[PDB]
Design a protein around this nucleic acid. Structure first.
Ligand SMILES: [Mg+2]
Length: 421
RNA sequence: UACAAGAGCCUUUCUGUUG
RNA sequence: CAACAGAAAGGCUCUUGUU
């Protein structure tokens, strides 16, 4: 198709070097973070068993991550003040509350986990809706034997979960939408599993709060079992809008809406409500308040040895209907096996986002993914909506819209924190 | 669950042919 | 009611070296 040029990532620090992505992945060595915030207090925790991951292994991992963060322009000064052992979801509460009420100004908690466990669910719920700080989790097997890319992606997640900026992108190469303070919002619905007629559905929304699209702000509300539409989009979009006004000190001119977790057969079903609900968020805030709203939908539905499609390939024929918009685009290159990256579609939009500018923006947000040094399948706000919806699945563990709604409400300084990376 | 797709199995949901 | 499907959403179980 049309392999779009990856933007120049502006790594900061003293060198202010640029890590240009090659084949979808960029190196992190000799590159320092743009707004790598100094780590004064931080805590590591061992929920993995001692027989598998040991204290020497954890100390070596901590030392190597600190040394690769010094190369990343992210000073983690001194040994971590907390390193203890615990296991179970019931042991999540006292340790996490201690880490809340012992280190003033603490911004991130780090835990290690063996595998698929509800302890991950409990720490995510306690961090994002009960206590109010970002939580970082890393698998057992990736702490024992640390590749440099492991520590690089981990340290990007650490830096973005503190509240700093990993790397802003090319300002002269950024799309002109950044010429005004603008917002990017993502939404995702994760339905209850089949055979269960009482679990509530999930309505998760994320939205930016900075000029460079590195800092976001999210919340989620429950709704009717397997409800495709978003129940209360006005309330949480208004919350994100007032958070944006607090943060950037300017009202948005353009807002962008990414849709995820929606089947192809009911797109209009989630349009006519939700866009209007966005208007219900915008009219009810200020008088004569009418910014432009775009509605595009994302679905995770040659290069290397595997011969996967290159990132950014454009094709508008032989897959979908000749009529309708049906703007068939993808912005990711596979690694091994087969390539089924993602599927972005434009309904009509209103901000007059041109195709090249919107494709530049979604590729930039794919590079603005703050969890790895790679261009990825779905954009950053779509990923944040997906993972915040996942966190909502971890918020109703052993718990319409009632108690459920109040068990998924994001804590007051957790919207301004990037708990979801 | 550093990230990233891939592959195997079970639902239970929605659109087709037939019924 | 059943059958040949395609798509969505969960749960599991295996691999890659992307520095
Ligand atoms: Mg989902």
């Amino acid at each position: 198709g049309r392999v779009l040029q990856p933007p120049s990532i502006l790594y900061g620090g003293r060198n202010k070097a640029i890590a240009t992505p090659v084949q979808g992945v960029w190196d992190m060595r000799n590159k320092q973070f743009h707004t790598g915030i100094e780590i004064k207090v931080w805590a590591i925790a061992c929920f993995a068993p001692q027989r598998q991951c040991t204290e020497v292994h954890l100390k070596s991992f901590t030392e190597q991550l600190r040394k690769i963060s010094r190369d990343a322009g992210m000073p983690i000064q001194g040994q971590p003040c907390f390193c203890k052992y615990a296991q179970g979801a019931d042991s999540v509460e006292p340790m996490f509350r201690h880490l809340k009420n012992t280190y003033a100004g603490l911004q991130l908690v780090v835990v290690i986990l063996p595998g698929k466990t509800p302890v991950y669910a409990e720490v995510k719920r306690v961090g994002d809706t009960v206590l109010g700080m970002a939580t970082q989790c890393v698998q057992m097997k990736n702490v024992q034997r640390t590749t440099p890319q492991t520590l690089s992606n981990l340290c990007l997640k650490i830096n973005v979960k503190l509240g700093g900026v990993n790397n802003i992108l090319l300002p002269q190469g950024r799309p002109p939408v950044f010429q005004q303070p603008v917002i990017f919002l993502g939404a995702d619905v994760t339905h209850p599993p089949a055979g269960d007629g009482k679990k509530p559905s999930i309505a998760a929304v994320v939205g930016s709060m900075d000029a460079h699209p590195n800092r976001y702000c999210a919340t989620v509300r429950v709704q009717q079992h397997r409800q495709e539409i978003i129940q209360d989009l006005a309330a949480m979009v208004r919350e994100l809008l007032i958070q944006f006004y607090k943060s950037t000190r300017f009202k948005p001119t353009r807002i962008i809406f990414y849709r995820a977790g929606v089947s192809e057969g009911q797109f209009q079903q989630v349009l006519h409500h939700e866009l209007l609900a966005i208007r219900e968020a915008c009219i009810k805030l200020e008088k004569d308040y009418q910014p432009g709203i775009t509605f595009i939908v994302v679905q995770k539905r040659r290069v290397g040895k595997s011969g996967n499609i290159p990132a950014g390939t454009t094709v508008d024929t032989k897959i979908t209907h000749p009529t309708e918009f049906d703007f068939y685009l993808c912005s990711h290159a596979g690694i091994q096996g087969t390539s089924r990256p993602s599927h972005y579609h434009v309904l009509w939009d209103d901000n007059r986002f041109s195709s090249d500018e919107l494709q530049i923006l979604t590729y930039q947000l794919c590079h603005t993914y703050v969890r790895c040094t790679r261009s990825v399948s779905i954009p950053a706000p779509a990923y944040y909506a997906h993972l915040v919806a996942f966190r909502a699945r971890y918020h109703l563990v052993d718990k319409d819209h009632q108690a459920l709604a109040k068990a998924v409400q994001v804590h007051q300084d957790t919207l301004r924190t990037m708990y979801f990376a």
